[PDB]
Write a protein that binds this ligand. Structure first.
Ligand SMILES: [Mg+2]
Ligand SMILES: [Mg+2]
Lengths: 286, 82, 82
DNA sequence: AACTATGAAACAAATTTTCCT
DNA sequence: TTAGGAAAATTTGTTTCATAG
């Protein structure tokens, strides 16, 4: 019995752990069927994402099955508006054969011991399905508009001696697939500082794209559930700045009366809607 | 090829479209009749009347989301201000 | 009483009858569609269908409350069905 | 004499697909 | 093939003007 793609899975079980070494670039412009291939998903510096398994000595080679799934909240499932796109030929180090499960496309690539079970996902581009065709499918009610962010999901089924097979799943960082979004949405590449006392009052030079001059970094605190309790304007522009750099003053945490450090999230919102993806920051005790 | 809400779904709504959260068989029938009345009379450019209505009425407040904007209903913004 | 259905009223209902009480313009179109896709295909024998569903399903309980016998939804039992 | 309900037209504008180098 | 731009299409969200109870 195969494992349904909708079923979430852990990244590790006991000693078995499948982890993404290098995550993909914050954005990849997917191609439509009516057009040519718009290359493979890439990695920040210049390479392509890398996936690795942990704790597999048996000499049998394994299969890592890549598939495009959702990002935006809830349970991670395959993405109804996107499909992976096999990329082979001339270049491309990693090899793969495709298949289609349920209604999703799934690429499988070789996970071999001769490379301590680590493969470079250099063969998977993204294909966009016409929101029209997919919204009116069979008993499906997922929103396609504005939904253009996906995740490179990776799976591997480890074969044990007892005949048992524990299933491991990953999930890459969200990727922005829309050309328009990639261009007009605020992007944060490399932070600068991560800690500061609840008091605040420190600089943290942010770098990324779409950092205009009307940008305005905002801070917020979420819950284990998903509720909001804090949104404090974090004044910017000490003067000017670098075309895509931003020097913001770290605000003053909720009540400053904390014995145990608190990790927090802060984004960038250019236009009245053009928001950026949440970030991470850490406050310290009293 | 849109599937229609099954009877139970509809019958349930008809019982809830009543503040009492309970209705009589005849009332349920009339809830259905009113619905027939509607979709029969407005089978024209409804989708337009839906954009219109969401904007005209103040009780429909569009709110922003991490994903996209979505419509909501201010249950208070309704009622009387006579 | 028995007021006729208005775009405002149906719209409110489509939205409120959503998991988190909020939906996209397109989702509201969908809702209306499934309603169209019923109230144009209803058999000339729907009342029987309604009576049939009321008792057949364990989610619709008849109670002797108030004025006369009325129908009601056993929410949790209905929620199970799904 | 407020208050309510329905609908075509014309904008303005945000997003998605198809086209073109 | 692999992109980068951007025109062509689609969609959404506002207002205004008229009609009737
Ligand atoms: Mg409104
Ligand atoms: Mg019953």
């Amino acid at each position: 019995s195969s494992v349904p793609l909708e079923w979430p899975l852990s990244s590790q079980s006991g000693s078995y752990e499948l982890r993404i070494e290098v995550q993909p670039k914050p954005h990849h412009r997917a191609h439509y069927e009516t057009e040519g291939s718009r290359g493979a998903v890439k990695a920040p510096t210049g390479g392509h994402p890398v996936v690795q398994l942990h704790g597999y000595m048996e000499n049998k080679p394994l299969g890592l099955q890549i598939f495009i799934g959702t990002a935006d909240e809830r349970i991670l499932k395959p993405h109804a508006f996107y499909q992976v796109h096999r990329i082979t030929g001339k270049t491309v180090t990693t090899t793969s054969y495709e298949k289609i499960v349920g209604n999703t496309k799934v690429l499988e690539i070789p996970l071999e011991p001769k490379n301590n079970m680590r493969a470079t996902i250099d063969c998977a581009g993204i294909l966009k399905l016409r929101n029209a065709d997919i919204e009116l499918r069979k008993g499906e009610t997922d929103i396609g508009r504005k939904n253009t962010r996906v995740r490179l999901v990776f799976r591997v089924h480890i074969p044990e001696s007892s005949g048992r097979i524990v299933s491991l799943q990953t999930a890459s960082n969200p990727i922005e697939c829309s050309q328009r979004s990639a261009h007009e949405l605020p992007m944060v590449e490399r932070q600068d500082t991560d800690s500061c006392l609840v008091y605040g009052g420190q600089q943290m030079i942010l770098t990324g794209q779409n950092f205009t001059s009307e940008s305005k970094v905002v801070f917020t605190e979420k819950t284990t559930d998903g509720q909001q309790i804090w949104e404090m304007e974090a004044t910017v522009a000490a003067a000017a700045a670098a075309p895509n750099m931003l020097f913001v003053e770290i605000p003053e945490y909720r009540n400053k009366h904390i014995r145990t450090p608190v990790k927090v999230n802060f984004y960038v919102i250019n236009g009245k809607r053009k928001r950026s993806q949440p970030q991470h920051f850490t406050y310290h005790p009293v | 090829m849109r599937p229609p809400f099954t009877y139970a779904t509809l019958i349930r709504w008809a019982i809830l479209e009543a503040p009492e959260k309970q209705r009589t068989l005849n009332e349920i029938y009339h809830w259905f009749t009113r619905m027939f009345a509607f979709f029969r009379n407005h089978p024209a450019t409804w989708k337009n009347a839906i954009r219109h209505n969401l904007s005209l009425h103040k009780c429909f407040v569009r709110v922003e989301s991490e994903k996209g904007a979505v419509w909501t209903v201010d249950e208070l913004e309704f009622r009387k201000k006579r």
